[PDB]
DNA sequence: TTAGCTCGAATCGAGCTAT
DNA sequence: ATAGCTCGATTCGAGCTAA
């Protein structure tokens, strides 16, 4: 009867490392191999009372009360020098290859059948459209997520790191390049094919990709978050901790391959958001709901049970979400 | 001796002894299915019951995190200043009309998840009434997510008729509805050797998987799903 | 009462520790506290500690612990708002300051 | 059903930087472009006690034996050269636009509602007063919070940077604009206009502000102050400590946006203090009280609430006041 | 209450039909 | 959707043991 598999493991491929954040000045940034890096350090900040009161705590008394003892606390805080306007953010873009292939799989007859439908996919239209979207969110910083909203000029470069040497050069405007819109462009496309050989198994590429924001003078920059354990006195209760590896201002590299996922276009809601994460259920973090909802038959689950185990093959635009779907990986499968 | 069946668990004893002390012993290991949890030498001069008294706090804290785990998921029925607390259900599933909410004065009553991000939608006294008849969690639900979904599903194309070990799970007194066979085959209608050849062991030539209209109201009558 | 009680019997029994405990290197080591929580260091100090431990008589170990209490109380907003945390305040100033009262006099 | 969504989150706009105190003299205000900056220095101090005592520490054996032993602090301080009378005082403001609409939202439309409020509030009253009053705030240095109190001559510069060079050029005299009256002038009408252009979304508008405050010959200066967690002796005690970022005495990013954000007039209570930051429940710390109390329906949830849910639109100086407080940002959106 | 087991009888699914 | 069939496999009840 071909039932799915109840192991289902899958490997990611497009593999970025955790991006490093530097400084220094516009029309030196061809030189920007010894930029010093951004350091996160402390400040204090004292805050009112801001939030909603649950109409016990509106009373005229209880709120000057409350006014009268201000929360102080320690936040992580992540500046320019006061000399320097640009931002480098600096990071490794592996991609791998061999996406259809799960890492565990319990049945033998259903890893036979995922292999056959994706090689069908790939062998129709290859990971051409998949890889132009992934060289789109390269081209453009989607990576640099709140460094990008008020930079007057940012633009990204993008090697191609053969034998430790770059064997083809990129240079981009990431603001020409919209975070709406996946155009058609010459260099875009032959990044793209470089992906699409990455992503078909062809070679091995390794890309270094290098974005550049004009931010302005001493301008607060915006490195990933990490998590407190809240524990300590409420003074110094380090509220909000900012995350480094070596004493220089980082970006996770998950955060960089969500922005990167940014390509699904195809979803049933409207084009007023645009492109969005390749999730299962189609998750968006920021507005709190589900798009591609499993009620209505276009999440990754019953679109892969549709066209893997009885030959019901959706719209093409699907099909690229599915096998976007398995180049982000997952563990797939019943519990 | 021979292993020891509590619902779904097993002691099953190590089949060579040693020697603690000067006395006899041998090693028991508590399985839940597949999953070993612990393993106990103990005297060979204890009775079975001893051996299962060994292991009874070890079976009762794994029900009690079970219960905290799969608690369902409880709604809160607030009035207009979303404060005091006029009724709790705890639901099998969550309205569909649920969004991101925080009460007005626009409508006297509001239901809402228990969860911290709250979610809800202005309700009637009558619209809340029908929403708590139609979704409340029967009082032992925390067992279906003991059970995986696709012998909980009202699907027919997509239902599995429970195992062995599954049926363990809702029908001996070791399991985690208390009931006897005999009472579960009372509540089916069945008789007895009919139920007991349903949660017969692999070491047996009659074996029958039960149906699904029998499963889903053995489900039913047992206050595991589908009984508000 | 207990809790104050138990303080009194743990700072006893450290009592029974090295005279100079307190003197170890650390970045961290409860200055304010090593006061109270070693004794026995103002012998070996007849210059450097004791006539500060003297002079000083610390007391607001005291109102540190009180704080530690304050952390170690339920955060409800309703007693806050009505007179029982009124009646907790007051039966707690009156066991600090029966608490306080007894580290007043450890120099005899 | 339209009911406010949980999580109602903004950023911020109207970001500032921290601002870098360094001293001079005056009539070298041109040429200050090397001057040193201003160094936090380590002092000791010795006072006597001079609280409130609680009727139980008069008796005078005590309070002259505490005076015996009185208290000794180390604190940090922050003074001018001695061959220096002017303070310089310089950080960078970029203004983004996109004030309506949130980072994070639950319901989908109480977003759709309120980005229509917004709309409609920019095109019948667009970012023009609220734009004088940024203005204002920003060409009279209250951002020298303490430094301006005793000034003998406070000015401030405004620049307008486009490709790191000046695109237009402000000079302003911070004691003739003053700290009470939103008067109207043709310099600052087109700040204005900028600030406008910025809060629109229209262009990008970077500001670097520099204001000269000539105070006298080695005085002292206040820079943000920082908090100690005590955990030293009871002699260096550390007692007060100052922000500095490298070596140089320096004011916190969010002080300057609070003294920029003073432009509340529109408070129930009389308006003989001033303006006040715009912020919910109006709080101001210095006074310890709230204007715009809840109970008097005039606080930034109610009327926002009536403005979106109920369609009650306040008067424009309220709804001046709830756009100010989109402006500023927030975590507004409880449970 | 657990844990099974025959033995004939009734039921069950999946093939076909007919109307 | 109604109405009904055959045929081999599975279930079912009421005896029974076994503990």
Same mark, same amino acid.
């Given at each position: 009867?071909?039932?799915?598999?109840?192991?289902?493991?899958?490997?990611?491929?497009?593999?970025?490392?955790?991006?490093?954040?530097?400084?220094?000045?516009?029309?030196?940034?061809?030189?920007?191999?010894?930029?010093?890096?951004?350091?996160?350090?402390?400040?204090?900040?004292?805050?009112?009372? +801001?939030?909603?009161?649950?109409?016990?705590?509106?009373?005229?008394?209880?709120?000057?009360?409350?006014?009268?003892?201000?929360?102080?606390?320690?936040?992580?805080?992540?500046?320019?020098?006061?000399?320097?306007?640009?931002?480098?953010?600096?990071?490794?873009?592996?991609?791998?290859?061999?996406?259809?292939?799960?890492?565990?799989?319990?049945?033998?007859?259903?890893?036979?059948?995922?292999?056959?439908?994706?090689?069908?996919?790939?062998?129709?239209?290859?990971?051409?459209?998949?890889?132009?979207?992934?060289?789109?969110?390269?081209?453009?910083?989607?990576?640099?997520?709140?460094?990008?909203?008020?930079?007057?000029?940012?633009?990204?470069?993008?090697?191609?790191?053969?034998?430790?040497?770059?064997?083809?050069?990129?240079?981009?405007?990431?603001?020409?390049?919209?975070?709406?819109?996946?155009?058609?462009?010459? /260099?875009?496309?032959?990044?793209?094919?470089?992906?699409?050989?990455?992503? +078909?198994? +062809?070679?091995?590429?390794?890309?270094?990709?290098?974005?550049?924001?004009?931010?302005?003078?001493?301008?607060?920059?915006?490195?990933?978050?990490?998590?407190?354990?809240?524990?300590?006195?409420?003074?110094?209760?380090?509220?909000?901790?900012?995350?480094?590896?070596?004493?220089?201002?980082?970006?996770?590299?998950?955060?960089?391959?969500?922005? @990167?996922?940014?390509?699904?276009?195809?979803?049933?809601?409207?084009?007023?958001?645009?492109?969005?994460?390749?999730?299962?259920?189609? +998750?968006?973090?920021?507005?709190?709901?589900?798009?591609?909802?499993?009620?209505?038959?276009?999440?990754?689950?019953?679109?892969?049970?549709?066209?893997?185990?009885?030959? /019901?093959? %959706?719209?093409? /635009?699907?099909?690229?979400?599915?096998?976007?779907?398995?180049?982000?990986?997952?563990?797939?499968?019943?519990? | 001796?021979?292993?020891?069946?509590?619902?779904?668990?097993?002691?099953? %004893?190590?089949?060579?002894?040693?020697?603690?002390?000067?006395?006899?012993?041998?090693?028991?290991?508590?399985?839940?299915?597949?999953?070993?949890?612990?393993?106990?030498?103990?005297?060979?001069?204890?009775?079975?019951?001893?051996?299962?008294?060994?292991?009874?706090?070890?079976?009762?804290?794994?029900?009690?995190?079970?219960?905290?785990?799969?608690?369902? !998921?409880?709604? /809160?029925?607030?009035?207009?200043?979303?404060?005091?607390?006029?009724?709790?259900?705890?639901?099998?599933?969550?309205?569909?009309?649920?969004?991101?909410?925080?009460?007005?004065?626009?409508?006297?009553?509001?239901?809402?998840?228990?969860?911290?991000?709250?979610?809800?939608?202005?309700?009637?006294?009558?619209?809340?009434?029908?929403?708590?008849?139609?979704?409340?969690?029967?009082?032992?639900?925390?067992?279906?997510?003991?059970?995986?979904?696709?012998? @909980?599903?009202?699907?027919?194309?997509?239902?599995?008729?429970?195992?062995?070990?599954?049926?363990?799970?809702?029908?001996?007194?070791?399991?985690?509805?208390?009931?006897?066979?005999?009472?579960?085959?009372?509540?089916? *209608? &069945?008789?007895?050797?009919?139920?007991?050849?349903?949660?017969?062991?692999?070491?047996?030539?009659?074996?029958?998987?039960?149906?699904?209209?029998?499963?889903?109201?053995?489900?039913?009558?047992? *206050?595991?799903?589908?009984?508000? | 009462?207990?809790?104050?009680?138990?303080?009194?019997?743990?700072?006893?029994?450290?009592?029974?520790?090295? %005279?100079?405990?307190?003197?170890?290197?650390?970045?961290?080591?409860?200055?304010?506290?090593?006061?109270?929580? !070693?004794?026995?260091?103002?012998?070996?100090?007849?210059?450097?500690?004791?006539?500060?431990?003297?002079?000083?008589?610390?007391?607001?170990?005291?109102?540190?612990?009180?704080?530690?209490?304050?952390?170690?109380?339920?955060?409800?907003?309703?007693?806050?708002?009505? %007179?029982?945390?009124?009646?907790?305040?007051?039966?707690?100033?009156?066991?600090?300051? &029966?608490?306080?009262?007894?580290?007043?006099?450890?120099?005899?």
């Amino acid at each position: 009867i071909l039932s799915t598999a109840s192991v289902l493991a899958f490997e990611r491929k497009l593999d970025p490392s955790d991006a490093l954040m530097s400084a220094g000045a516009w029309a030196q940034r061809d030189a920007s191999q010894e930029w010093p890096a951004v350091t996160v350090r402390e400040k204090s900040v004292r805050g009112t009372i +801001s939030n909603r009161l649950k109409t016990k705590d509106r009373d005229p008394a209880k709120l000057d009360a409350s006014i009268q003892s201000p929360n102080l606390q320690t936040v992580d805080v992540a500046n320019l020098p006061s000399d320097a306007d640009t931002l480098k953010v600096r990071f490794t873009l592996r991609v791998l290859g061999g996406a259809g292939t799960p890492s565990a799989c319990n049945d033998a007859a259903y890893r036979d059948k995922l292999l056959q439908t994706v090689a069908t996919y790939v062998n129709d239209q290859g990971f051409a459209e998949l890889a132009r979207r992934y060289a789109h969110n390269l081209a453009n910083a989607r990576f640099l997520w709140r460094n990008r909203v008020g930079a007057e000029a940012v633009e990204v470069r993008i090697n191609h790191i053969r034998q430790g040497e770059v064997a083809r050069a990129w240079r981009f405007d990431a603001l020409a390049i919209g975070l709406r819109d996946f155009k058609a462009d010459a /260099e875009l496309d032959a990044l793209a094919e470089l992906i699409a050989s990455g992503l +078909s198994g +062809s070679g091995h590429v390794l890309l270094e990709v290098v974005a550049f924001a004009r931010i302005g003078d001493g301008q607060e920059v915006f490195p990933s978050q990490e998590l407190i354990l809240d524990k300590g006195d409420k003074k110094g209760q380090k509220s909000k901790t900012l995350y480094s590896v070596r004493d220089a201002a980082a970006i996770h590299s998950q955060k960089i391959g969500n922005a @990167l996922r940014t390509i699904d276009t195809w979803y049933p809601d409207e084009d007023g958001l645009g492109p969005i994460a390749v999730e299962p259920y189609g +998750s968006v973090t920021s507005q709190g709901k589900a798009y591609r909802q499993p009620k209505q038959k276009l999440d990754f689950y019953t679109l892969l049970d549709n066209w893997v185990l009885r030959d /019901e093959a %959706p719209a093409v /635009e699907q099909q690229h979400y599915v096998i976007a779907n398995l180049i982000r990986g997952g563990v797939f499968g019943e519990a | 001796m021979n292993a020891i069946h509590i619902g779904p668990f097993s002691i099953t %004893p190590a089949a060579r002894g040693l020697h603690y002390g000067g006395l006899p012993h041998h090693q028991w290991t508590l399985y839940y299915g597949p999953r070993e949890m612990a393993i106990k030498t103990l005297p060979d001069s204890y009775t079975s019951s001893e051996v299962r008294d060994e292991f009874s706090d070890i079976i009762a804290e794994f029900v009690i995190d079970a219960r905290h785990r799969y608690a369902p !998921d409880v709604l /809160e029925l607030v009035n207009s200043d979303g404060d005091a607390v006029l009724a709790r259900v705890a639901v099998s599933r969550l309205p569909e009309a649920l969004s991101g909410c925080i009460p007005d004065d626009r409508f006297p009553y509001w239901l809402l998840t228990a969860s911290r991000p709250r979610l809800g939608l202005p309700v009637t006294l009558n619209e809340y009434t029908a929403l708590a008849v139609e979704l409340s969690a029967p009082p032992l639900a925390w067992i279906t997510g003991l059970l995986p979904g696709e012998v @909980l599903t009202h699907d027919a194309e997509e239902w599995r008729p429970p195992t062995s070990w599954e049926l363990r799970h809702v029908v001996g007194e070791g399991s985690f509805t208390g009931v006897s066979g005999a009472a579960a085959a009372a509540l089916l *209608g &069945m008789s007895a050797t009919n139920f007991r050849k349903y949660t017969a062991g692999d070491s047996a030539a009659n074996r029958q998987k039960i149906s699904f209209a029998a499963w889903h109201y053995l489900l039913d009558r047992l *206050g595991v799903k589908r009984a508000s | 009462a207990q809790i104050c009680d138990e303080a009194l019997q743990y700072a006893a029994r450290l009592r029974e520790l090295e %005279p100079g405990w307190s003197a170890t290197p650390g970045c961290q080591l409860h200055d304010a506290e090593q006061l109270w929580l !070693d004794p026995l260091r103002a012998q070996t100090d007849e210059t450097f500690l004791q006539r500060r431990l003297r002079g000083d008589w610390p007391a607001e170990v005291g109102n540190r612990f009180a704080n530690w209490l304050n952390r170690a109380v339920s955060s409800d907003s309703q007693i806050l708002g009505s %007179p029982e945390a009124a009646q907790w305040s007051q039966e707690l100033s009156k066991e600090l300051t &029966m608490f306080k009262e007894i580290l007043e006099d450890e120099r005899d």
